[PDB]
């Protein structure tokens, strides 16, 4: 399937935090109410809580200043589910690069 | 609770009608929280066997099961506020097909 272009993020960010990155959504959401989620190292696996996504808008943010010298890349996966919990789309890979 | 482990869920093979509601996994703090499950059986193959209601926390099975093919699943439930922030620590869920 089509690959979402990776993000580039300057290390030592100053926010203010949370600092909005990009919105990851399904076009079919304003047709069918969808609930968004994100998994992987940086989201729900260590380090937890660095990348969050709004359940309704699908807007993703970073919660703190990054450092490439400690970790230069994160690979997450966005999910979309209906009001019942049935996944509507397959999981999409999200790539983020810390730069400096 | 704060590290108490949830007892395994035992479900008989050859089950309906579906989706068949199993058990409610929720956080007493439900503040409007949203629930989601991860792992083999949910968002990893075999995909879509189990699903959780975003608002209620009701875990359901979607089709019949067979012990001889897969004997048990190991999922993880999550809780996140209306803004996506993690509020609870994810819990492990074990399902044994009998
Ligand atoms: Yb640096
Ligand atoms: Yb059997």
Swiss-Prot record, chain B:
Job of this protein: Calcium-dependent cell adhesion protein; preferentially mediates homotypic cell-cell adhesion by dimerization with a CDH2 chain from another cell. Cadherins may thus contribute to the sorting of heterogeneous cell types. Acts as a regulator of neural stem cells quiescence by mediating anchorage of neural stem cells to ependymocytes in the adult subependymal zone: upon cleavage by MMP24, CDH2-mediated anchorage is affected, leading to modulate neural stem cell quiescence.
Binding partners and assembly: Homodimer (via extracellular region). Can also form heterodimers with other cadherins (via extracellular region). Dimerization occurs in trans, i.e. with a cadherin chain from another cell. Interacts with CDCP1. Interacts with PCDH8; this complex may also include TAOK2. The interaction with PCDH8 may lead to internalization through TAOK2/p38 MAPK pathway. Identified in a complex containing FGFR4, NCAM1, CDH2, PLCG1, FRS2, SRC, SHC1, GAP43 and CTTN. May interact with OBSCN (via protein kinase domain 2). Interacts with FBXO45.
Protein name, UniProt field: Cadherin-2
Distribution of this protein across tissues and organs: Expressed in cardiac muscle (at protein level).
Post-translational modification: Cleaved by MMP24. Ectodomain cleavage leads to the generation of a soluble 90 kDa N-terminal soluble fragment and a 45 kDa membrane-bound C-terminal fragment 1 (CTF1), which is further cleaved by gamma-secretase into a 35 kDa. Cleavage in neural stem cells by MMP24 affects CDH2-mediated anchorage of neural stem cells to ependymocytes in the adult subependymal zone, leading to modulate neural stem cell quiescence.
Domains (record comment): Three calcium ions are usually bound at the interface of each cadherin domain and rigidify the connections, imparting a strong curvature to the full-length ectodomain. Calcium-binding sites are occupied sequentially in the order of site 3, then site 2 and site 1.
Domain Cadherin: 3-98
Intrachain disulfide bonds: none
Coiled coil, from the record: none
Consequence the record notes for mutating residue 5 to A: Decreased calcium-dependent cell-cell adhesion
Record localization: Cell membrane; Cell membrane, Sarcolemma; Cell junction; Cell junction, Adherens junction
Positions bound to Ca(2+) 2: 13, 68
Mutation effect (residue 4 to A/Y): Loss of calcium-dependent cell-cell adhesion
Shown part of the complete sequence: 160 to 258 of 906
Outcome reported for the amino acid change (mutating residue 4 to A): Loss of dimerization
Disruption phenotype: Embryonic lethality.
